[PDB]
Amino acid sequence: NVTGLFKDCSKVITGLHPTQAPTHLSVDTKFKTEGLCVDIPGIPKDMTYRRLISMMGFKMNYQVNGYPNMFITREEAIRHVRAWIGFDVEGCHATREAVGTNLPLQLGFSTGVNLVAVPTGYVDTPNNTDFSRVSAKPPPGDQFKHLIPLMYKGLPWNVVRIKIVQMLSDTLKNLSDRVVFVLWAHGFELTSMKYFVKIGPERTCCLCDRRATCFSTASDTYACWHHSIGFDYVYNPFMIDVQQWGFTGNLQSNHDLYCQVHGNAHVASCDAIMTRCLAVHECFVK
Amino acid sequence: AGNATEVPANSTVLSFCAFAVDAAKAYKDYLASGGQPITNCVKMLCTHTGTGQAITVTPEANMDQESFGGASCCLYCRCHIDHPNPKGFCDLKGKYVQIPTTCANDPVGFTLKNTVCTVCGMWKGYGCSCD
Numbered sequence A: 001n002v003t004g005l006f007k008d009c010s011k012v013i014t015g016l017h018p019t020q021a022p023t024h025l026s027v028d029t030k031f032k033t034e035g036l037c038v039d040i041p042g043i044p045k046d047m048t049y050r051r052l053i054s055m056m057g058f059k060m061n062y063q064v065n066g067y068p069n070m071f072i073t074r075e076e077a078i079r080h081v082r083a084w085i086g087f088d089v090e091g092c093h094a095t096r097e098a099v100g101t102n103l104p105l106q107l108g109f110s111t112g113v114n115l116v117a118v119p120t121g122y123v124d125t126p127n128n129t130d131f132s133r134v135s136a137k138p139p140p141g142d143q144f145k146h147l148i149p150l151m152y153k154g155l156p157w158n159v160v161r162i163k164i165v166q167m168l169s170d171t172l173k174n175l176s177d178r179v180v181f182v183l184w185a186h187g188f189e190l191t192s193m194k195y196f197v198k199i200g201p202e203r204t205c206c207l208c209d210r211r212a213t214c215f216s217t218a219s220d221t222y223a224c225w226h227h228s229i230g231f232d233y234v235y236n237p238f239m240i241d242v243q244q245w246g247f248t249g250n251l252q253s254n255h256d257l258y259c260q261v262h263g264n265a266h267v268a269s270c271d272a273i274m275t276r277c278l279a280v281h282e283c284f285v286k
Numbered sequence B: 001a002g003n004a005t006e007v008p009a010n011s012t013v014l015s016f017c018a019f020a021v022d023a024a025k026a027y028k029d030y031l032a033s034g035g036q037p038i039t040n041c042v043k044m045l046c047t048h049t050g051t052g053q054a055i056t057v058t059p060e061a062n063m064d065q066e067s068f069g070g071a072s073c074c075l076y077c078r079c080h081i082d083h084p085n086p087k088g089f090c091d092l093k094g095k096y097v098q099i100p101t102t103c104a105n106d107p108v109g110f111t112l113k114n115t116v117c118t119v120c121g122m123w124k125g126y127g128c129s130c131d
């Protein structure tokens, strides 16, 4: 019984030394005996590895006192319709030194904004995890052709996350005290959130009584949407996966049952606009 | 493609701590709300006749300890997140860590809560000979 969360995507045929492996599963078979591991004299640690670790498969089903639930009910989402932001991500695939995981490339929102990131992954090394640019390519096929020029238009993640916070703040400061990301098949959107969301207990802003919606790694401070200039992380966002409301078939077919004004332009922002639009038609129209 | 490193019993706690602003506080809180400690650590078979020092090149458990692979006992290594150490480097990965047997059900929590004495090399309150 294993999970894909934190799968090692490197092409190294062998596992790690007992002192470097993050887990018993990741120790190489040569060290395993009698239900545990042994140190073998003369078998050295590896001092030059770079192993890409997959961020696919997060499970946000904890129940910890004072930490809010990220995923919310349809009833709670409806009360917070003004906080709804559709979100979709188009990925690229790890290649060359690694294979088997998806990296965020184009992040799209119902505001119409698309942001393009440099393909970046979490690479384990002998000393730490290096959050760094990794080799990547768009998936093969004519439906992924538009992503080809985006491979050389990416911004580093430290810049992308500041832009996400600024866009959400500008959109929501006069509409809500929170954000509700409206998703369709959320797994990859949740993997992408690892790059720009932090969580913790409910906090109040540094300059007022409003709840904190942003965090700054520069000063370890919290801010609401009005006081977040320069902040790099979204803090305690909420979210809902519309696909879980019983729909059959793809996003476009369900969106088109209610709406004809949003033609599919095959881009992350369009999927994000269609997801929010479908959720609005389902909950508020007729 | 690829090789799994984790088991389903750890998905919730690792996901929670991977997103937290304060990962150590999140792990402490997860346990206080009834969560299970992180499992799938690298536990060693040894002769239990070692020096008992906290962090070592090879397993050094005495009869009051167990030896573990150091990266597997580090919350930051397990979640693949930044270390709070000066240049972001780990002091446990690449070493073995000796943990008192009374605490061996939660090695990750043990290393987050405790400190090594720089004079004698043993855990403060669990071997330190300086008091």
Ligand SMILES: COc1cccc2cn[nH]c12
Pocket: B024, B025, B027, B028, B029, B031, B108, B109, B110, B112, B113
């Ligand atoms: C795993 O539990 C902890 C982590 C860090 C600090 C403390 C204090 N009590 N428990 C803690």
Ligand SMILES: [Zn+2]
Pocket: A205, A206, A207, A208, A209, A210, A223, A224, A225, A226, A227
């Ligand atoms: Zn404020």
Ligand SMILES: [Zn+2]
Pocket: A255, A259, A260, A261, A262, A273, A274, A277, A278
């Ligand atoms: Zn529409």
Ligand SMILES: [Zn+2]
Pocket: B071, B074, B075, B076, B077, B078, B083, B090, B091, B092, B093
């Ligand atoms: Zn570590």
Ligand SMILES: [Zn+2]
Pocket: B117, B118, B119, B120, B121, B122, B128, B129, B130, B131
């Ligand atoms: Zn001492």
